[PDB]
Protein backbone atom coordinates (compact mmCIF):
# COMPACT_ATOMS: atom_id res chain seq x y z
CA UNK A 1 0.00 0.00 0.00
CA UNK A 2 1.15 3.22 0.23
CA UNK A 3 0.88 6.25 3.35
CA UNK A 4 -1.40 8.17 1.90
CA UNK A 5 -3.75 5.71 1.34
CA UNK A 6 -5.68 6.03 4.32
CA UNK A 7 -6.50 9.29 3.65
CA UNK A 8 -9.67 8.85 2.66
CA UNK A 9 -10.93 7.01 6.12
CA UNK A 10 -12.13 8.83 9.31
CA UNK A 11 -9.77 9.21 12.63
CA UNK A 12 -11.55 6.76 14.95
CA UNK A 13 -12.18 8.18 18.32
CA UNK A 14 -11.18 6.64 21.95
CA UNK A 15 -13.15 4.70 23.14
CA UNK A 16 -13.26 0.97 25.06
CA UNK A 17 -10.69 -1.03 22.46
CA UNK A 18 -7.40 -1.09 23.39
CA UNK A 19 -4.31 -2.02 20.71
CA UNK A 20 -0.85 -2.64 21.01
CA UNK A 21 0.94 -1.86 18.46
CA UNK A 22 4.48 -1.34 17.21
CA UNK A 23 6.27 1.54 15.50
CA UNK A 24 9.08 0.78 13.56
CA UNK A 25 11.38 -2.06 13.12
CA UNK A 26 14.39 -2.71 14.94
CA UNK A 27 15.81 0.70 17.02
CA UNK A 28 13.34 2.83 15.91
CA UNK A 29 10.86 -0.36 17.67
CA UNK A 30 8.65 1.99 19.45
CA UNK A 31 5.80 0.36 21.27
CA UNK A 32 2.28 2.22 21.91
CA UNK A 33 -1.31 2.00 23.25
CA UNK A 34 -4.06 2.31 21.21
CA UNK A 35 -7.76 3.13 22.14
CA UNK A 36 -10.80 2.93 19.84
CA UNK A 37 -14.88 2.63 19.43
CA UNK A 38 -14.87 0.36 17.01
CA UNK A 39 -12.75 -1.98 15.20
CA UNK A 40 -15.52 -3.81 12.38
CA UNK A 41 -15.66 -0.58 10.51
CA UNK A 42 -13.46 -0.74 7.58
CA UNK A 43 -13.94 3.32 7.10
CA UNK A 44 -12.14 4.18 10.31
CA UNK A 45 -8.23 4.22 11.21
CA UNK A 46 -6.03 4.70 14.41
CA UNK A 47 -3.34 6.75 13.70
CA UNK A 48 -0.26 6.75 16.74
CA UNK A 49 0.52 10.29 15.66
CA UNK A 50 -2.91 11.59 17.34
CA UNK A 51 -3.28 9.38 20.38
CA UNK A 52 -1.23 6.53 21.86
CA UNK A 53 0.76 5.94 24.63
CA UNK A 54 4.26 4.84 24.92
CA UNK A 55 5.44 1.46 26.81
CA UNK A 56 7.96 -0.50 27.16
CA UNK A 57 6.96 -2.89 25.19
CA UNK A 58 5.77 -6.95 26.05
CA UNK A 59 6.44 -10.65 25.53
CA UNK A 60 2.94 -11.08 26.05
CA UNK A 61 -0.19 -9.33 25.80
CA UNK A 62 -2.51 -10.59 28.41
CA UNK A 63 -5.81 -9.14 29.79
CA UNK A 64 -7.17 -9.31 32.72
CA UNK A 65 -10.51 -9.10 32.58
CA UNK A 66 -12.05 -5.95 30.99
CA UNK A 67 -9.68 -4.23 33.79
CA UNK A 68 -6.46 -4.59 33.41
CA UNK A 69 -3.74 -5.25 30.49
CA UNK A 70 -0.68 -6.86 32.15
CA UNK A 71 2.52 -6.88 29.83
CA UNK A 72 4.52 -10.64 30.80
CA UNK A 73 8.43 -10.22 30.26
CA UNK A 74 11.04 -12.34 31.06
CA UNK A 75 12.68 -10.54 33.97
CA UNK A 76 9.70 -5.84 34.35
CA UNK A 77 6.04 -7.23 34.18
CA UNK A 78 3.59 -4.22 33.99
CA UNK A 79 0.15 -3.49 33.84
CA UNK A 80 -1.81 -0.60 32.72
CA UNK A 81 -5.47 0.37 33.16
CA UNK A 82 -7.77 2.93 30.96
CA UNK A 83 -8.11 6.26 32.55
CA UNK A 84 -11.74 8.55 32.23
CA UNK A 85 -10.15 9.88 29.07
CA UNK A 86 -10.35 6.60 27.17
CA UNK A 87 -6.53 7.08 27.33
CA UNK A 88 -3.90 3.70 28.41
CA UNK A 89 -2.32 4.57 31.39
CA UNK A 90 0.63 2.69 33.27
CA UNK A 91 0.23 1.06 36.83
CA UNK A 92 2.61 2.77 39.61
CA UNK A 93 3.15 -1.18 40.41
CA UNK A 94 5.74 -3.79 38.42
CA UNK A 95 6.18 -6.81 38.94
CA UNK A 96 9.51 -9.58 38.48
CA UNK A 97 8.41 -13.17 36.88
CA UNK A 98 10.98 -15.42 36.23
CA UNK A 99 11.16 -17.08 33.10
CA UNK A 100 8.15 -19.21 32.21
CA UNK A 101 7.17 -22.23 29.70
CA UNK A 102 3.32 -21.69 29.87
CA UNK A 103 0.42 -19.22 31.46
CA UNK A 104 -2.71 -19.24 32.19
CA UNK A 105 -5.78 -17.66 34.43
CA UNK A 106 -6.98 -18.77 37.65
CA UNK A 107 -9.27 -16.84 39.19
CA UNK A 108 -7.76 -13.32 39.59
CA UNK A 109 -4.46 -14.72 39.76
CA UNK A 110 -2.45 -14.73 36.31
CA UNK A 111 -0.54 -18.06 37.02
CA UNK A 112 3.20 -18.66 34.84
CA UNK A 113 4.77 -21.99 35.28
CA UNK A 114 7.42 -24.19 34.25
CA UNK A 115 9.57 -27.37 34.85
CA UNK A 116 12.81 -26.50 36.30
CA UNK A 117 15.11 -27.73 39.39
CA UNK A 118 14.12 -28.45 42.58
CA UNK A 119 16.19 -28.15 46.06
CA UNK A 120 15.20 -31.22 48.10
CA UNK A 121 16.76 -35.15 47.44
CA UNK A 122 19.98 -34.02 45.82
CA UNK A 123 21.86 -37.06 44.79
CA UNK A 124 25.65 -36.84 43.35
CA UNK A 125 27.08 -38.90 40.68
CA UNK A 126 30.03 -39.85 39.32
CA UNK A 127 30.84 -40.77 35.72
CA UNK A 128 33.57 -40.93 33.13
CA UNK A 129 32.67 -38.10 30.38
CA UNK A 130 33.76 -38.20 26.80
CA UNK A 131 37.34 -37.10 27.54
CA UNK A 132 38.35 -39.80 30.30
CA UNK A 133 38.80 -37.75 33.18
CA UNK A 134 36.44 -38.72 36.36
CA UNK A 135 33.41 -36.53 36.88
CA UNK A 136 31.34 -35.92 40.20
CA UNK A 137 28.34 -34.06 39.94
CA UNK A 138 24.75 -33.08 42.09
CA UNK A 139 21.97 -33.44 40.29
CA UNK A 140 18.14 -32.37 41.60
CA UNK A 141 14.68 -33.51 40.45
CA UNK A 142 12.72 -31.76 38.19
CA UNK A 143 9.43 -29.38 40.28
CA UNK A 144 7.20 -27.42 38.98
CA UNK A 145 7.74 -23.78 39.82
CA UNK A 146 4.56 -21.62 39.61
CA UNK A 147 4.70 -17.88 40.08
CA UNK A 148 1.67 -15.70 40.46
CA UNK A 149 0.12 -12.25 39.79
CA UNK A 150 -2.32 -11.12 42.14
CA UNK A 151 -3.57 -8.60 39.41
CA UNK A 152 -6.77 -7.88 41.74
CA UNK A 153 -4.65 -7.19 44.76
CA UNK A 154 -1.85 -6.23 42.45
CA UNK A 155 1.14 -8.63 44.15
CA UNK A 156 3.50 -11.28 43.02
CA UNK A 157 4.48 -14.35 44.18
CA UNK A 158 6.75 -16.75 43.42
CA UNK A 159 5.45 -19.73 45.02
CA UNK A 160 7.33 -22.95 46.67
CA UNK A 161 7.55 -25.36 44.39
CA UNK A 162 11.23 -26.64 44.13
CA UNK A 163 11.21 -27.60 48.21
CA UNK A 164 7.94 -29.06 48.14
CA UNK A 165 7.75 -33.05 46.80
CA UNK A 166 3.98 -32.52 45.56
CA UNK A 167 4.95 -30.63 42.99
CA UNK A 168 7.62 -32.91 41.48
CA UNK A 169 7.66 -33.29 37.62
CA UNK A 170 9.87 -36.67 37.80
CA UNK A 171 8.33 -39.55 37.30
CA UNK A 172 5.09 -37.69 36.96
CA UNK A 173 3.31 -40.15 33.96
CA UNK A 174 4.60 -43.56 36.02
CA UNK A 175 7.70 -44.26 33.48
CA UNK A 176 10.30 -42.09 34.87
CA UNK A 177 10.29 -39.27 32.43
CA UNK A 178 9.65 -35.66 33.79
CA UNK A 179 6.91 -33.48 32.13
CA UNK A 180 6.16 -30.04 31.22
CA UNK A 181 2.53 -28.27 31.74
CA UNK A 182 1.22 -26.90 28.54
CA UNK A 183 -1.62 -24.35 29.25
CA UNK A 184 -3.51 -23.81 32.44
CA UNK A 185 -7.46 -23.94 31.41
CA UNK A 186 -10.01 -23.26 34.80
CA UNK A 187 -12.62 -25.76 35.06
CA UNK A 188 -14.40 -24.56 38.54
CA UNK A 189 -11.78 -25.17 40.53
CA UNK A 190 -9.36 -28.09 38.94
CA UNK A 191 -6.39 -26.82 36.24
CA UNK A 192 -6.32 -29.02 33.42
CA UNK A 193 -3.11 -29.02 31.88
CA UNK A 194 -1.34 -31.00 28.95
CA UNK A 195 1.63 -33.11 30.59
CA UNK A 196 4.28 -32.98 27.71
CA UNK A 197 6.54 -35.61 28.40
CA UNK A 198 10.17 -33.98 28.21
CA UNK A 199 11.85 -37.33 28.44
CA UNK A 200 14.47 -38.51 31.20
CA UNK A 201 16.37 -35.07 32.99
CA UNK A 202 19.78 -35.87 34.50
CA UNK A 203 18.40 -36.82 38.02
CA UNK A 204 16.19 -39.66 36.40
CA UNK A 205 18.55 -40.83 34.53
CA UNK A 206 20.74 -42.13 37.72
CA UNK A 207 17.68 -43.32 39.22
CA UNK A 208 17.75 -46.94 40.21
CA UNK A 209 14.37 -48.95 39.33
CA UNK A 210 14.13 -52.19 40.89
CA UNK A 211 17.91 -53.06 41.02
CA UNK A 212 18.33 -51.65 36.99
CA UNK A 213 20.80 -48.95 37.20
CA UNK A 214 19.25 -45.98 34.67
CA UNK A 215 16.09 -48.18 34.90
CA UNK A 216 14.07 -45.80 33.46
CA UNK A 217 16.09 -46.09 30.04
CA UNK A 218 14.23 -48.41 28.02
CA UNK A 219 15.82 -51.44 26.35
CA UNK A 220 17.48 -50.55 23.08
CA UNK A 221 17.64 -46.80 24.45
CA UNK A 222 20.89 -46.42 25.63
CA UNK A 223 22.37 -44.76 22.74
CA UNK A 224 19.97 -42.15 22.45
CA UNK A 225 21.30 -40.58 25.85
CA UNK A 226 23.29 -37.44 25.15
CA UNK A 227 27.02 -37.94 26.46
CA UNK A 228 28.13 -34.19 26.59
CA UNK A 229 26.43 -30.57 26.84
CA UNK A 230 25.58 -30.10 23.45
CA UNK A 231 23.33 -27.51 21.49
CA UNK A 232 22.90 -23.85 21.98
CA UNK A 233 19.66 -21.62 22.89
CA UNK A 234 16.54 -23.16 24.10
CA UNK A 235 17.68 -26.73 22.37
CA UNK A 236 20.42 -27.83 24.55
CA UNK A 237 21.35 -30.70 26.27
CA UNK A 238 23.60 -31.77 29.46
CA UNK A 239 25.33 -34.94 30.28
CA UNK A 240 23.57 -37.90 31.01
CA UNK A 241 20.00 -36.65 30.38
CA UNK A 242 18.06 -37.74 27.43
CA UNK A 243 16.36 -35.41 25.39
CA UNK A 244 12.65 -35.73 24.34
CA UNK A 245 9.99 -38.56 25.28
CA UNK A 246 10.14 -42.20 24.89
CA UNK A 247 6.54 -43.03 24.61
CA UNK A 248 5.71 -40.45 21.55
CA UNK A 249 2.65 -42.51 20.94
CA UNK A 250 0.50 -41.11 23.85
CA UNK A 251 -1.40 -38.03 25.34
CA UNK A 252 -1.43 -37.11 29.13
CA UNK A 253 -3.80 -34.49 30.66
CA UNK A 254 -3.59 -33.43 34.17
CA UNK A 255 -5.73 -32.45 36.53
CA UNK A 256 -4.78 -30.34 39.46
CA UNK A 257 -7.29 -29.79 42.53
CA UNK A 258 -6.35 -26.33 42.90
CA UNK A 259 -3.79 -23.46 42.08
CA UNK A 260 -1.02 -25.21 44.43
CA UNK A 261 -0.83 -27.98 42.20
CA UNK A 262 -0.42 -30.23 45.14
CA UNK A 263 -3.09 -33.13 44.77
CA UNK A 264 -3.38 -34.24 41.10
CA UNK A 265 -4.39 -36.77 38.37
CA UNK A 266 -3.39 -37.72 34.96
CA UNK A 267 -5.43 -39.68 32.43
CA UNK A 268 -3.87 -41.06 28.99
CA UNK A 269 -4.97 -41.20 25.99
CA UNK A 270 -3.48 -43.41 22.76
CA UNK A 271 -4.77 -41.83 19.83
CA UNK A 272 -2.88 -38.44 19.65
CA UNK A 273 0.32 -37.24 20.64
CA UNK A 274 1.41 -34.78 23.18
CA UNK A 275 -0.74 -31.77 23.15
CA UNK A 276 1.16 -28.30 22.88
CA UNK A 277 2.41 -25.87 20.49
CA UNK A 278 6.38 -24.99 20.36
CA UNK A 279 7.82 -22.64 18.23
CA UNK A 280 11.67 -22.27 20.52
CA UNK A 281 10.84 -22.25 24.08
CA UNK A 282 7.15 -21.62 24.80
CA UNK A 283 4.23 -24.38 25.28
CA UNK A 284 1.78 -22.91 23.35
CA UNK A 285 -1.88 -24.29 25.26
CA UNK A 286 -4.06 -26.84 23.41
CA UNK A 287 -7.02 -27.74 26.21
CA UNK A 288 -9.51 -25.72 25.85
CA UNK A 289 -12.95 -25.65 27.77
CA UNK A 290 -15.67 -25.13 25.08
CA UNK A 291 -19.66 -24.50 25.90
CA UNK A 292 -20.61 -28.10 25.56
CA UNK A 293 -18.78 -28.76 29.05
CA UNK A 294 -16.08 -30.54 27.11
CA UNK A 295 -12.39 -29.77 27.12
CA UNK A 296 -10.82 -30.58 23.94
CA UNK A 297 -7.43 -31.75 23.53
CA UNK A 298 -5.55 -30.65 20.50
CA UNK A 299 -2.29 -32.38 19.04
CA UNK A 300 -0.12 -31.36 16.08
CA UNK A 301 2.05 -34.33 16.43
CA UNK A 302 4.94 -32.33 16.91
CA UNK A 303 7.38 -35.51 17.53
CA UNK A 304 7.39 -36.52 13.83
CA UNK A 305 10.27 -33.84 13.36
CA UNK A 306 12.40 -35.90 15.68
CA UNK A 307 15.23 -37.38 14.07
CA UNK A 308 15.41 -41.12 15.48
CA UNK A 309 12.34 -43.20 14.63
CA UNK A 310 12.00 -43.96 18.81
CA UNK A 311 11.20 -40.14 19.69
CA UNK A 312 8.58 -40.49 16.74
CA UNK A 313 4.72 -40.82 16.49
CA UNK A 314 2.91 -42.52 14.48
CA UNK A 315 -0.65 -41.00 15.06
CA UNK A 316 -1.32 -38.21 13.25
CA UNK A 317 -2.34 -34.67 14.39
CA UNK A 318 -5.99 -34.96 15.92
CA UNK A 319 -8.33 -33.63 19.32
CA UNK A 320 -10.21 -35.70 21.63
CA UNK A 321 -11.86 -34.10 24.66
CA UNK A 322 -12.80 -34.90 28.03
CA UNK A 323 -16.02 -34.30 29.86
CA UNK A 324 -15.11 -31.95 32.41
CA UNK A 325 -19.02 -32.29 34.54
CA UNK A 326 -17.81 -35.90 36.81
CA UNK A 327 -16.94 -36.90 39.59
CA UNK A 328 -13.00 -36.50 40.23
CA UNK A 329 -12.87 -39.91 40.27
CA UNK A 330 -14.56 -40.51 36.89
CA UNK A 331 -12.27 -37.83 34.84
CA UNK A 332 -10.92 -39.62 31.85
CA UNK A 333 -11.23 -39.63 27.87
CA UNK A 334 -14.52 -39.64 26.60
CA UNK A 335 -14.03 -42.93 24.37
CA UNK A 336 -16.41 -42.32 21.52
CA UNK A 337 -14.92 -39.14 20.20
CA UNK A 338 -12.12 -38.76 17.98
CA UNK A 339 -11.01 -36.16 15.19
CA UNK A 340 -8.01 -36.30 12.49
CA UNK A 341 -7.10 -32.98 11.96
CA UNK A 342 -6.76 -32.13 7.97
CA UNK A 343 -5.95 -29.88 6.16
CA UNK A 344 -8.72 -28.75 3.14
CA UNK A 345 -6.63 -30.52 0.65
CA UNK A 346 -6.92 -33.82 2.60
CA UNK A 347 -3.10 -33.83 3.95
CA UNK A 348 -2.66 -33.89 7.75
CA UNK A 349 -2.66 -30.88 9.68
CA UNK A 350 0.23 -29.17 11.10
CA UNK A 351 -0.65 -26.33 13.74
CA UNK A 352 0.90 -24.01 16.31
CA UNK A 353 -2.06 -22.66 18.21
CA UNK A 354 -5.21 -23.13 18.28
CA UNK A 355 -7.69 -20.34 20.32
CA UNK A 356 -11.46 -21.02 21.17
CA UNK A 357 -14.20 -18.56 20.30
CA UNK A 358 -18.02 -20.23 20.84
CA UNK A 359 -20.21 -22.88 20.87
CA UNK A 360 -18.61 -25.84 18.60
CA UNK A 361 -15.94 -23.29 16.88
CA UNK A 362 -12.26 -23.16 17.34
CA UNK A 363 -9.56 -21.22 15.42
CA UNK A 364 -6.17 -22.60 14.94
CA UNK A 365 -3.10 -21.33 13.30
CA UNK A 366 -1.70 -23.54 10.88
CA UNK A 367 1.76 -23.88 8.58
CA UNK A 368 1.56 -23.33 4.97
CA UNK A 369 2.91 -26.43 2.70
CA UNK A 370 6.52 -26.87 4.03
CA UNK A 371 4.94 -28.38 7.38
CA UNK A 372 6.63 -27.64 10.73
CA UNK A 373 9.94 -26.52 8.40
CA UNK A 374 7.68 -23.30 6.99
CA UNK A 375 5.61 -20.85 8.35
CA UNK A 376 2.22 -21.17 10.13
CA UNK A 377 -0.14 -18.52 9.25
CA UNK A 378 -3.11 -20.08 7.61
CA UNK A 379 -5.84 -19.35 9.97
CA UNK A 380 -8.60 -22.16 9.68
CA UNK A 381 -11.70 -22.89 11.78
CA UNK A 382 -12.53 -26.42 12.99
CA UNK A 383 -15.63 -27.68 14.13
CA UNK A 384 -16.61 -29.99 17.16
CA UNK A 385 -18.86 -31.72 15.35
CA UNK A 386 -17.24 -31.89 12.11
CA UNK A 387 -14.74 -34.52 10.43
CA UNK A 388 -11.67 -33.28 11.38
CA UNK A 389 -11.08 -31.55 7.77
CA UNK A 390 -10.14 -27.68 8.60
CA UNK A 391 -12.11 -24.93 6.96
CA UNK A 392 -10.72 -21.89 5.32
CA UNK A 393 -11.51 -18.22 6.12
CA UNK A 394 -13.49 -16.07 3.39
CA UNK A 395 -12.47 -12.72 3.71
CA UNK A 396 -8.91 -12.68 4.92
CA UNK A 397 -5.48 -11.43 2.57
CA UNK A 398 -3.21 -13.75 0.84
CA UNK A 399 0.34 -12.11 1.60
CA UNK A 400 -0.34 -12.79 5.32
CA UNK A 401 3.10 -11.51 7.05
CA UNK A 402 2.40 -10.82 10.94
CA UNK A 403 -1.06 -11.74 13.25
CA UNK A 404 -1.46 -10.80 16.74
CA UNK A 405 -0.69 -13.14 19.17
CA UNK A 406 -3.88 -13.36 20.96
CA UNK A 407 -7.23 -12.65 19.34
CA UNK A 408 -10.27 -10.85 20.84
CA UNK A 409 -13.46 -13.04 21.15
CA UNK A 410 -16.58 -10.80 21.34
CA UNK A 411 -19.53 -10.93 23.31
CA UNK A 412 -21.26 -13.22 20.66
CA UNK A 413 -18.75 -15.19 19.23
CA UNK A 414 -16.61 -13.13 16.64
CA UNK A 415 -12.68 -13.19 16.69
CA UNK A 416 -10.72 -10.22 16.30
CA UNK A 417 -7.91 -11.02 14.49
CA UNK A 418 -5.38 -8.05 13.29
CA UNK A 419 -3.70 -9.17 10.03
CA UNK A 420 -0.88 -7.69 8.42
CA UNK A 421 -0.01 -8.20 5.17
CA UNK A 422 3.07 -7.69 3.29
CA UNK A 423 1.32 -4.41 1.31
CA UNK A 424 -0.46 -2.56 3.56
CA UNK A 425 -0.73 -1.48 7.10
CA UNK A 426 -1.83 -4.33 9.94
CA UNK A 427 -5.97 -3.89 9.53
CA UNK A 428 -8.44 -5.83 12.24
CA UNK A 429 -10.81 -8.45 10.67
CA UNK A 430 -14.03 -9.72 12.48
CA UNK A 431 -13.92 -13.60 11.80
CA UNK A 432 -17.68 -15.45 12.07
CA UNK A 433 -16.22 -18.82 12.71
CA UNK A 434 -19.87 -20.46 12.06
CA UNK A 435 -19.97 -19.15 8.34
CA UNK A 436 -16.31 -18.80 8.18
CA UNK A 437 -16.27 -15.41 6.72
CA UNK A 438 -14.18 -12.60 7.27
CA UNK A 439 -15.09 -9.12 7.19
CA UNK A 440 -12.29 -5.94 7.18
CA UNK A 441 -12.54 -3.75 9.87
CA UNK A 442 -10.20 -0.60 12.08
CA UNK A 443 -7.11 -0.11 9.61
CA UNK A 444 -3.60 0.55 12.62
CA UNK A 445 -1.49 2.81 10.82
CA UNK A 446 1.64 0.64 12.17
CA UNK A 447 4.22 -1.66 11.57
CA UNK A 448 2.71 -5.05 13.51
CA UNK A 449 0.16 -4.97 16.19
CA UNK A 450 0.53 -7.63 18.74
CA UNK A 451 -2.74 -7.98 20.56
CA UNK A 452 -6.06 -6.17 20.61
CA UNK A 453 -8.92 -6.44 23.80
CA UNK A 454 -11.44 -4.75 25.34
CA UNK A 455 -11.52 -2.80 28.58
CA UNK A 456 -13.39 -0.52 30.44
CA UNK A 457 -12.50 2.78 32.16
CA UNK A 458 -11.85 3.44 36.01
Request: aromatic content about 12%; charged content about 20%.
Amino acid sequence: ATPTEVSNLTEVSKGNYVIAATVGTGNNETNVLLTADRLDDPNYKVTPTVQGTQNDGATYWVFYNQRSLFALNYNQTASYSLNPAFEMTKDPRTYKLSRFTTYGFYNDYIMTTSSGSGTIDAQSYTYTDKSGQSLTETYYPRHFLPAYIDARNQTAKDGTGAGDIRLRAENFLGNGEYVTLAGLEQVGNYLYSAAVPMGLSQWGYIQTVDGREHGYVREGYEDLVKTESGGSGSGSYKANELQWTQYPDECWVAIFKDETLTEHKVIKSDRISYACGRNRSQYYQMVWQADDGYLYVFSPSYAKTMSDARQQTRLPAGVVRIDTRASWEALDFDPSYYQALKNPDGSEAAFLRSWYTSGNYFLLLAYDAQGFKGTANRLLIFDTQGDGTLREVSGLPTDISALSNTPYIDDEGHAYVVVSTSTGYPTVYKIDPAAATASKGLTIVATSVAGVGKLQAN
